[PDB]
């Protein structure tokens, strides 16, 4: 099952064989063996293909590389010729535009109804949008490339029949697709000419005289590639169209100035990059790689100038000039070409843009493609500096080790008591024994002379080889490395030249984990502790090339299965045991931070709460790269740390598995079509090393042991902080580390030399850190490490002097009709588009471009899936076999407006513009549907559109989906995959531990326990869902779900051995049934619910009635509580007061009780603003973003504090706490805990009751609402306006307990204020404060109710006396 997007690196080694079968010439591969190797059974019959022979009957024997021709095709290809696809993708274009225009509608109507709208109203809005969509440069090319992608996917699916050959002729270009391969026939006149008279692409393989007799009297030439450059080009075209459309639309909202760069500058950048690539080949990506650092440097210069602020731009300019000079000396460019080639970076340097525009332009980096990777250069890059002799200073290593131990001791002391009962001689620590006697940890300022004493401290094994609570980490559908016995079987046995004596049976993880007869954690500990990874059959460590990237070559390693298990075990142990003494994620912005707390934390010379006040703190920062550390690690530096990690646990030789086995392996890249050089059958057991192999790998490997390396880096930073008396903060994210230095000033130092002093302090800290790191054997780059004062970029967020910069083209440009969503499911594609739109609108400040793009892509995806589906036969029509009549625009328009919760296909809810976490997904959907039906004069369809027919759902998905509806159209394909996995487990479960967990009566026991969990009065689904995850049923459920793609379903031999019926037919049947479920209408609805839902005129009542009618079999008569919440859009109303105005609602004498409301006011302090204060989104304020209305009262303290617990102990404690807290009106609670607790721990009841805290709260519904925080709300607006507003809720009085989520009120108010004023001058705002008055129609008083249980489980859970996530001794 071929995929619709790029998921593999681009390697063209096998094409060398294809051109050999057609009598052509092409030197793609650097391995001479492919020059004279036997051709496979396939790609050899091309001599007998009539179409291929006719295609290549008028072209020269010599060919050209595809590296130099991609930019030519990206411009010379447009949709004008004849294409074999009968329904053209451009035929259904007008309907797409109509649907898109229907969203400058109700979206705007929704905003006006809410009260947001916009002060400036322009009549010319529809025609401008229509012209912007119609007048796009990349419009028809996108449709043509999608047609090409559909055709090539259909051809690739068969690859064994006569239908795998397709032909396209478009003006100047000819394309012939055949079974994973594409032949391009292009005119010669389009290629740039070298000064010797030959094309630039032909000088790599041919001499000047050689490439003049091969062409002779010919006008067209042929290039050969795989069926993966086409998908890359399609993605490129789609991304370019998306960004151009977004930039063009953004100009309509704000003509004065927008946050997107332009739609004409980006076109010039695209053309310049394409020309540079066409001239310089795949080697030209070293200049495209500079778009990001140059943008960062330009952003850095958008503030106050400093003598060292321009060093970044100067260094980047020097680097790009040197790179451009170096790779062009050998090439013989014409004097005219050498001037045009210097237009990419020349344009980038001379840019004059606001910081927001540059931040948005930062995102367009992979819009030119990706290079071609070779297995030789990729390994030459890593070999050259992974076997390099180093020089080290022992004193720095000793100090780093001492700081490591000190940090571990401090973390242990800070939590759960004090100290750890050192079992060492007191005379060997003269100066630390007194602190232990007084039971006080030494303060930081005076830890410089007792550092060495920390070497002498001894302690028991603080941590435990326990506390793993996820089996999904041991089965993750990844690939491993074959054993040493059969290591050359992964190569194709025709390029190799011999048949390998040994052949492996499997390569995947999930079908190897199930066959592990002797599993369990202690087995892995025994395997690692006995040095069993040094056995002769466990040393392979294959390589694999990295995904889409612009680097020359990157790789990740693969180990045999038991060593992978050991690696996963070590990572899991280090994740929560260690790596907690060294907090990695420490995102802090000193600008928007309170003065008193910052000054308290920034006082190095003690006196955190006793130092004199009135001392401003200014912070600086610098950024380093942590990835490059991986290969620079040596055993002589990391041995003491690994030994200490071993000693802190009960292990002996576990954490040093890597350094003991990596040098003993034979390093190579496991690629199918190029084995290592000079490999024969004779030298099989002792193969020689060549350009793509080596033996003594002394360094590290990325991803392996990352936590330990991060901890060592943090220890080094702490050592630097100790050496020089400065306050240091460290943050790590991805391959970046940000170090922040706090200065502290005694005031009376204005703001001119203050920043200079802060920058100098940062520079000296960076110099000291570089010295220490170089002494440890890792070399930083002084010409690449840069010091910033207020501009901090890190991971997912970048700030400029406390002002957040928008970054929305990262996600908005990835929208596409086609995505890998399990058998091309429509629901998955629509959900992906919706979540991409939500994530994009979470950033930036424009609303319409992203939603217009999403609306454009939704209808296109629907049409493509309807007409061209890969899962069915050619010529099929999904819209005719279900309805029986042609499917029209009205049906799609009506079906795309019903929310997915009620059974529709609407994922673009406008309410997401205010907040991302909804209190109730049913009431909001009902409100959206009612508003949409009210806009159109077709309101008489609400009742016969939400009733529908309840489905046959057992009492296992209600627990899984607490706030949901029992309809068959709102379900996804998860249950199908879970059932398939369960059957596969049942057929083959020789693991001997999974079999015990998955016994004969597992399903019926799960059904009984879920039925009992919902047999209370009243029934609460949220509590049942929260409590169900700690039972063995939850473990079985989490083990069951591991299928993620539609390639394991069909290509796995273990799954497909069930015989019975093929999975493909079941998939087709379920797809047809699901398609019939939608677009049908008035065929799956009843009448009893429709008449029972009349004259309700209340969304909360409608939702409650719908929930009650559904799950009728589960709930006979027992009421359901704690699931229904109101929609806040329908709850509050705004008045939008102005300075000298009074609220009419508040001015009606407030007769009966009064008029509760929420007040929003705007501040006047600006603090900082970049570039100006014209827009509120460019400014910040005093700060605060609220604190909390006393949160809640917390009670309960455990009688005894446990030591390092186990995995099941915490789960049992939480079980006991929840069961005790939920039910309190009866004494039967002790009879309910025992059946659950007896399957988790050996302890008995009344012995854990003192371990659990005496939790006692009120309402219990509110505790599960926000106090437990099932999903913390956040917001979908940039955190800029929220710092310039004051929100008062105390004026509500008696608070309408309450049925109001107070966290969402602040988000609603802030988002409404931001959306109301987003394209207007700050000084032109005519409104001072806002009143949010609540309506007495969706607010209710919830009483305090508890849970009662009549019966008990009466199940025997004692049978679970085995290992893993279940009962332990």
């Amino acid at each position: 099952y071929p995929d619709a997007r790029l998921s593999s690196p681009i390697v063209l080694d096998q094409c060398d064989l294809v051109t050999r079968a057609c009598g052509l010439y092409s030197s793609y591969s650097l391995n001479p063996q492919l020059r004279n190797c036997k051709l496979p059974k396939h790609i050899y019959r091309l001599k007998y293909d009539v179409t291929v022979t006719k295609f290549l009957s008028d072209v020269p024997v010599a060919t050209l590389p595809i590296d130099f021709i991609v930019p030519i095709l990206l411009k010379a290809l447009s949709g004008n010729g004849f294409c074999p696809v009968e329904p053209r993708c451009q035929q259904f274009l007008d309907e797409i535009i109509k649907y898109t225009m229907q969203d400058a509608l109700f979206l705007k109507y929704y905003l006006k109804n809410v009260g947001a709208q916009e002060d400036c109203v322009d009549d010319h809005f529809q025609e401008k949008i229509l012209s912007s969509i119609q007048g796009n440069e990349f419009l028809h090319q996108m449709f043509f490339w999608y047609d090409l992608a559909i055709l090539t996917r259909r051809g690739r699916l068969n690859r064994g029949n006569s239908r795998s050959t397709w032909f396209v002729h478009d003006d100047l270009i000819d394309i012939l697709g055949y079974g994973d391969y594409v032949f391009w026939k292009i005119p010669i006149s389009l290629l740039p000419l070298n000064t010797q008279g030959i094309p630039h692409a032909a000088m790599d393989w041919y001499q000047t005289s050689v490439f003049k007799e091969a062409v002779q009297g010919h006008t067209h030439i042929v290039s050969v590639s795989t069926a993966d450059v086409l998908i890359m080009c399609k993605d490129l075209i789609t991304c370019r169209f998306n960004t151009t459309l977004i930039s063009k639309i953004a100009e309509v909202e704000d003509p004065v100035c927008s946050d997107y760069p332009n739609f004409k500058i980006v076109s010039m950048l695209y053309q310049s990059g394409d020309y540079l690539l066409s001239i310089l080949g795949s080697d030209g990506y070293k200049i495209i790689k500079f778009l990001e650092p140059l943008c960062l440097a330009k952003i850095q210069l958008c503030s106050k100038y400093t003598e060292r602020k321009g060093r970044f731009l100067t260094q980047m300019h020097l680097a790009v000039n040197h790179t451009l000079e170096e790779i062009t000396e050998i090439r013989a460019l014409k004097p005219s070409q050498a001037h045009k080639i210097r237009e990419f970076h020349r344009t980038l340097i001379r840019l004059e843009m606001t910081p927001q525009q540059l931040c948005e332009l930062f995102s367009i980096q992979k819009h030119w493609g990706h290079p071609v990777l070779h297995s030789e250069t990729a390994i030459q890059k890593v070999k050259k500096h992974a076997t390099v002799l180093k020089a080290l200073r022992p004193i720095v290593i000793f100090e780093t080790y001492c700081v490591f131990k000190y940090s571990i001791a401090k973390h242990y002391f800070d939590s759960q008591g004090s100290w750890y009962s050192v079992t060492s001689d007191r005379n060997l620590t003269p100066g630390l024994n007194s602190y232990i006697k007084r039971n006080q940890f030494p303060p930081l300022p005076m830890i410089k002379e007792l550092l060495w004493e920390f070497y002498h401290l001894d302690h028991p094994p603080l941590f435990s080889t326990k506390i793993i609570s996820d089996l999904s980490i041991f089965i993750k559908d990844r690939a491993t490395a074959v054993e040493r016995t059969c290591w050359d079987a992964v190569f194709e046995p025709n390029v190799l030249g011999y048949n390998p004596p040994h052949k492996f049976s499997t390569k995947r993880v999930p079908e190897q984990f199930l066959e592990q007869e002797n599993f369990s954690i202690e087995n892995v500990l025994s395997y690692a502790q006995k040095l069993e990874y040094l056995l002769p059959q466990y040393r392979n460590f294959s390589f694999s090339l990295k995904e889409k990237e612009l680097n020359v070559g990157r790789t990740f390693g693969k180990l045999p299965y038991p060593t992978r298990n050991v690696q996963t075990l070590c990572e899991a142990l280090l994740a929560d045991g260690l790596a907690k003494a060294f907090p990695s994620n420490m995102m802090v912005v000193t600008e928007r931070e309170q003065k008193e707390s910052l000054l308290h934390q920034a006082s190095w010379h003690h006196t955190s709460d006793d130092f004199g006040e009135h001392a401003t703190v200014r912070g600086s920062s610098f950024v380093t790269d942590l990835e490059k550390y991986n290969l620079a690690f040596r055993y002589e530096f990391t041995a003491p740390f690994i030994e200490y990690c071993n000693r802190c646990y009960g292990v002996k030789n576990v954490f040093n598995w890597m350094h003991y086995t990596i040098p003993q392996c034979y390093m190579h890249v496991s690629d199918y079509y190029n084995p290592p050089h000079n490999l024969t059958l004779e030298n099989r057991n002792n193969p020689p090393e060549g350009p793509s192999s080596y033996r003594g790998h002394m360094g590290g490997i990325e991803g392996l042991q990352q936590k330990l390396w991060t901890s060592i880096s943090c220890a080094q930073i702490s050592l630097v902080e100790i050496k020089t008396g400065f306050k240091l903060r460290s943050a790590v994210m991805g391959d970046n580390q940000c170090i922040t230095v706090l200065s502290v000033f005694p005031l009376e130092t204005d703001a001119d030399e203050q920043e200079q002093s802060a920058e100098d302090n940062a520079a000296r800290v960076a110099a000291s850190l570089a010295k220490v790191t170089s002494a440890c054997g890792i070399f930083l780059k002084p010409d690449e490490t840069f010091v910033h004062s207020g501009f901090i970029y890190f991971g997912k967020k970048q700030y400029l002097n406390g002002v957040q910069l928008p970054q929305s083209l990262k996600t908005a440009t990835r929208m596409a009709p086609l995505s890998d969503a399990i058998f091309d499911d429509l629901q998955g594609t629509l959900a992906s588009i919706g979540t991409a739109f939500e994530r994009s609108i979470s950033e930036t400040r424009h609303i319409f471009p992203c939603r217009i793009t999403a609306a454009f892509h939704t209808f296109f995806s629907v049409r493509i899936l309807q007409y061209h589906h890969l899962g069915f036969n050619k010529g099929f029509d999904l819209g005719q076999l279900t309805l029986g009549k042609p499917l029209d625009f009205g049906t799609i328009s009506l079906a795309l407006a019903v929310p997915q919760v009620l059974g529709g296909l609407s994922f673009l809810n406008p309410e997401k513009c205010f907040y991302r976490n909804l209190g109730d997904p049913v009431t909001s959907g009902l409100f959206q549907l009612k508003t949409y039906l009210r806009m159109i004069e077709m309101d008489d369809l609400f009742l016969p559109l939400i009733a529908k027919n309840p489905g046959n759902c057992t009492a296992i998905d209600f627990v899984l989906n607490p706030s949901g509806l029992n309809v068959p159209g709102s379900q996804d394909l998860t249950s199908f995959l879970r059932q398939i996995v369960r059957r596969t487990i049942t057929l083959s479960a020789k693991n001997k531990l999974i079999n015990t967990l998955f016994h004969a009566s597992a399903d019926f026991e799960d059904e009984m326990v879920c039925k009992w969990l919902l047999s209370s009065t009243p029934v609460m689904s949220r509590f049942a869902a929260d409590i169900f995850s700690r039972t063995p049923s939850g473990k079985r459920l989490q083990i069951l779900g591991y299928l993620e793609g539609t390639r394991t379903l069909l290509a796995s031999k273990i799954i497909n051995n069930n015989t019975e019926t093929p999975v493909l037919d079941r998939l087709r049947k379920i797809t047809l049934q699901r398609w019939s479920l939608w677009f049908s209408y008035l065929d799956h609805c009843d009448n009893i619910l429709a008449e029972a839902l009349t004259q309700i005129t209340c969304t909360v009542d409608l939702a409650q009635i719908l929930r009650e009618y559904s799950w009728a079999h589960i709930l006979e008569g027992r009421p359901l509580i704690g699931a229904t919440l109101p929609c806040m859009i329908e709850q509050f109303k705004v008045v939008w007061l102005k300075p000298y105005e009074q609220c009419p609602q508040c001015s009606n004498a407030k007769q009966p009780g009064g008029k509760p409301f929420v007040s929003v006011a705007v501040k006047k302090h600006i603090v900082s603003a970049w570039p100006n204060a014209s827009r509120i989104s460019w400014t910040i304020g005093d700060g605060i973003p609220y604190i909390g209305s006393r949160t809640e009262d917390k009670i309960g303290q455990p009688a005894i504090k446990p030591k390092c617990p186990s995995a099941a102990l915490r789960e049992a404690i939480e079980l006991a706490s929840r069961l005790t807290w939920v039910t309190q009106g009866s004494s039967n609670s002790d009879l309910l805990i025992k059946p659950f607790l007896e399957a988790r721990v050996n302890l008995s009841v009344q012995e854990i009751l003192q371990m659990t805290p005496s939790h006692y709260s009120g309402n219990i519904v509110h505790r599960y609402n926000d106090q437990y925080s099932p999903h913390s709300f956040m917001a979908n607006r940039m955190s800029n306006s929220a710092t310039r507003l004051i929100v008062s809720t105390n004026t509500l009085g008696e608070f309408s307990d309450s049925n109001i989520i107070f966290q969402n009120v602040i988000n609603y108010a802030v988002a409404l204020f931001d959306i109301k004023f987003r394209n207007t001058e700050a000084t032109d705002i005519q409104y001072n404060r806002a009143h949010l008055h609540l309506t007495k129609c969706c607010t209710r008083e919830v009483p305090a109710q508890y849970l009662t249980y009549t019966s008990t489980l009466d199940l025997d859970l004692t049978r679970y006396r085995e290992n893993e996530l279940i009962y332990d001794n």
């Binding site: 022992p394 004193i395 290593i397 002589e636 530096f637 520079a763 000296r764 070399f779 490490t785």
Partner: protein, 260 residues
């Protein structure tokens, strides 16, 4: 008789009691001599704490050193002998001192292995690092010429000649850093590159009252086409800072210059 015997016995008892007193005095004298002599032992008790501190610190340091160094280390004589077999640093870590190996590097007489040389040079290159010159770029004539070229639109313009003249004069006078800093400051202010170059010519003290360079050409074909419109007769006393950028000498003796 009896009285005399009693008197004699009493005298003997008195003498023996006197001897007892003498013996007790001697015993007390010995005890007090012991007490007086035991004082230095009490006084030397304070010197043990510093000894314990230093010895424990040394033990910890060298214990960590032997822990981090493998069983295969090879003594100094072993490394010296094995250096006679190609470069080939011996297997297993080796110990040096900074001064010894530093002094050995220059003395190219005992064939120090190359890899050791690059390793030590890389390690020692970071010592000369301070708050200044940490990430300070270096500037040459060609690099500055290219940087200034990339900001000027067009080709063959007299501004290119002005840039070349400025670069040559800065290379001669060793003042490129000041020129680059002033150019960057002018660009950051908001001026055009032409205005920045004019400010460089006017402001830098070196360019004040300097004779424009003379370039020998034979006819109009040498000078670019963009410079065709900027030919003026040479004044008797031309000034480089007055707007004049260069002076061209013709084959027949004619002298012409360019002005902005």
């Amino acid at each position: 008789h009896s009285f005399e015997e009693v008197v004699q016995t009493l005298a003997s008892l008195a003498t023996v009691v006197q001897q007892q007193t003498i013996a007790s005095e001697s015993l007390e004298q010995r005890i007090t001599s012991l007490e007086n002599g035991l004082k230095p032992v009490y006084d030397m008790a304070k010197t043990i704490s510093s000894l314990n501190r230093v010895c424990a610190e040394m033990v910890a340091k060298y214990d960590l050193l032997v822990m981090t160094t493998g069983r295969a280390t090879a003594t100094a004589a072993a490394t010296e002998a094995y250096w006679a077999e190609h470069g080939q640093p011996p297997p297993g870590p080796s110990l040096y001192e900074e001064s010894a190996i530093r002094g050995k590097i220059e003395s190219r007489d005992e064939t120090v292995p190359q890899s050791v040389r690059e390793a030590f040079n890389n390690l020692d290159s970071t010592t000369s690092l301070t708050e200044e010159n940490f990430g300070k770029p270096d500037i040459s004539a060609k690099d500055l010429r290219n940087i200034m070229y990339d900001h000027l639109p067009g080709f063959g313009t007299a501004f290119h000649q002005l840039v070349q003249v400025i670069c040559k004069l800065g290379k001669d006078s060793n003042s490129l850093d000041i020129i680059h800093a002033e150019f960057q400051a002018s660009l950051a202010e908001g001026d055009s590159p032409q205005c920045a170059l004019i400010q460089i010519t006017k402001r830098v003290p070196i360019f004040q009252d300097a004779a424009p360079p003379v370039i020998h050409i034979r006819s109009r074909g040498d000078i670019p086409r963009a410079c065709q419109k900027s030919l003026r007769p040479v004044p008797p006393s031309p000034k480089i800072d007055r707007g004049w950028v260069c002076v061209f000498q013709l084959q027949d003796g004619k002298t012409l210059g360019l002005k902005i």
